[PDB]
UniProtKB/Swiss-Prot annotation, chain A:
Keywords: ATP-binding, Cell cycle, Cell division, Magnesium, Manganese, Metal-binding, Mitosis, Nucleotide-binding, Nucleotidyltransferase, Nucleus, Transferase. Belongs to the DNA polymerase type-B-like family. It comes from Saccharomyces cerevisiae (strain ATCC 204508 / S288c). It is found in: Nucleus. Its main location: nucleus. The gene is PAP2. Its EC number is 2.7.7.19. Mg(2+) binds at D78, D80. GO terms for molecular function: 5'-deoxyribose-5-phosphate lyase activity; ATP binding; metal ion binding; mRNA binding; poly(A) RNA polymerase activity. This is Poly(A) RNA polymerase protein 2. The chain holds residues 161 to 481 of 584 of the full protein. It is an enzyme of class 2 (transferase). GO terms for biological process: base-excision repair; cell division; histone mRNA catabolic process; meiotic DNA double-strand break formation; negative regulation of DNA recombination; nuclear mRNA surveillance of mRNA 3'-end processing; nuclear polyadenylation-dependent antisense transcript catabolic process; nuclear polyadenylation-dependent CUT catabolic process. One of its GO terms (cellular component) is TRAMP complex. ATP binds at G143, K168, N273, R277. Present with 7550 molecules/cell in log phase SD medium.
Curated annotation (Swiss-Prot), chain B:
Belongs to the AIR1 family. Present with 1800 molecules/cell in log phase SD medium. Component of the TRAMP (TRF4) complex which has a poly(A) RNA polymerase activity and is involved in a post-transcriptional quality control mechanism limiting inappropriate expression of genetic information. Polyadenylation is required for the degradative activity of the exosome on several of its nuclear RNA substrates like cryptic transcripts generated by RNA polymerase II and III, or hypomethylated pre-tRNAi-Met. Both complexes polyadenylate RNA processing and degradation intermediates of snRNAs, snoRNAs and mRNAs that accumulate in strains lacking a functional exosome. It is found in: Nucleus. Component of the TRAMP complex (also called TRF4 complex) composed of at least HUL4, MTR4, PAP2/TRF4 and either AIR1 or AIR2. Interacts with HMT1 and NPL3. The interaction with NPL3 requires the presence of HMT1. Interacts directly with PAP2. A zinc finger (CCHC-type) spans 28-45. This is Protein AIR2.
Length: 323, 64
């Protein structure tokens, strides 16, 4: 119910509510962004865990990949690590059981859970001293070509990180961000935002600067993907680092489509399948974006028509995201 | 019915121009049919979203 990111950052006196919003987005993002101390601790614990892995396999190393090596992670989310000795393949599991047994014994984990992120077996736990959440696997879970797209998209796309964090937070407050239960995966979310940004009338024309317009773009993102996107008929891909729509009917690789209504995004490492196939709860996802649009827009009307005294210390984002 | 928008699908107290404001300094794709050359908003086919929008989106050729 509190909106800590608002404290000492009131924009209630702003003329354009869509600026109010833009500024609040930046406040939240900075609030969810790490401190030097936070970083110090993270490195220590990671190193502590690496050191515990060396004990089983002195040849192995440990690297952070994913949300945490970009900065697209929500606080408290698992930080993903790969272990590097030739320990993967079919020996993957047997070796995870050993790492688990060992973590528990050395007190770097309490409850350890085995799970799977797309045929890649993963071990989730909490390092007790720091309370940090870790997920370990012997193989990166976000493809290879996909990962590279991410870093590149982040270079040539102002606003990408900010909108992704907001959308990520939104989806998470509702439990709409896990594939296990048919939510949107990480790459998929990044894709949607990226596409939207890169083919927005005011953006391809270089008329607008997203970083100065993330309020509207946020709303319009939920508007596009909540109210208008032809989920049944339109797919997403990339021809030459350029976001692209193509009709399902032309994607022959999958055209015996058992289920018409579902998100279709071209797998960067295999143009043969969509990585969004697993998001079976896409119906409720669309309902939720529309909800977000409704909430944001309604809120904007509500404030743009109230006394400045009633605006003091108010939050636009607060009720849409939860947190 | 709005006097800012000139439209008659909502009141002034609900005109999208309230929140849809921009601060100013290849090919196009339609969200309705995966077709190129036009925006999904002003497209010719039956709409792929059973959800209405008698008032436009960001994605019309009006470049807004
Ligand atoms: Zn109006
Ligand atoms: Zn069309």
């Amino acid at each position: 119910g509190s909106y800590p990111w608002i404290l000492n950052h009131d924009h209630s006196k702003q003329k354009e509510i869509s600026d109010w919003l833009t500024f609040e987005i930046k406040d939240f993002v900075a609030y969810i962004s790490p401190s030097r101390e936070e970083i110090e601790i993270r490195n220590q614990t990671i190193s502590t865990i690496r050191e515990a892995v060396k004990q089983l396999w002195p040849d192995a190393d440990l690297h952070v990949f994913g949300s945490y090596s970009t900065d697209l992670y929500l606080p408290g989310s698992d930080i993903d690590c790969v272990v590097t000795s030739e320990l993967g393949g079919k020996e993957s599991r047997n070796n995870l059981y050993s790492l688990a047994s060992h973590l528990k014994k050395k007190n770097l984990a309490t409850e350890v859970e085995v799970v799977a992120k797309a045929r890649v077996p993963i071990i989730k736990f909490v390092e007790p001293h720091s309370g940090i959440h870790i997920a370990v696997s012997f193989e990166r879970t976000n493809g290879i070509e996909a990962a590279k797209l991410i870093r590149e998209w982040l270079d040539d796309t102002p606003g990408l990180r900010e909108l992704v964090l907001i959308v990520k937070q939104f989806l998470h407050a509702r439990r709409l961000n896990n594939v296990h239960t048919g939510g949107l995966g990480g790459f998929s979310i990044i894709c949607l935002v990226f596409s939207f940004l890169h083919m927005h009338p005011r953006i391809i024309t270089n008329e607008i600067d997203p970083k100065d317009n993330l309020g509207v773009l946020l709303i319009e993102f939920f508007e596009l993907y909540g109210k208008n996107f032809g989920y049944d008929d339109v797919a997403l891909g990339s021809s030459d680092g350029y976001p692209v729509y193509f009709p399902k009917s032309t994607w022959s690789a999958i055209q015996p489509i058992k289920n018409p209504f579902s998100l279709a995004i071209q797998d960067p490492g295999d143009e043969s399948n969509n990585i969004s196939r697993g998001s079976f709860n896409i119906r409720d996802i669309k309902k939720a974006f529309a909800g977000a649009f409704d909430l944001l827009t309604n809120r904007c009307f509500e404030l743009h028509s109230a006394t400045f005294k009633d605006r003091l210390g108010k939050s636009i984002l607060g009720n849409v995201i939860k947190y | 019915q709005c006097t800012l928008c000139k439209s008659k699908k909502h009141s002034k107290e609900r005109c999208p121009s309230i929140w849809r404001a921009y601060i100013l300094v290849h090919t196009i794709y339609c969200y309705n049919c995966g077709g190129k050359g036009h925006f999904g908003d002003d497209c010719k086919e039956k709409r792929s979203s059973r959800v209405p929008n008698e008032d436009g989106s960001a994605f019309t050729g009006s470049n807004l």
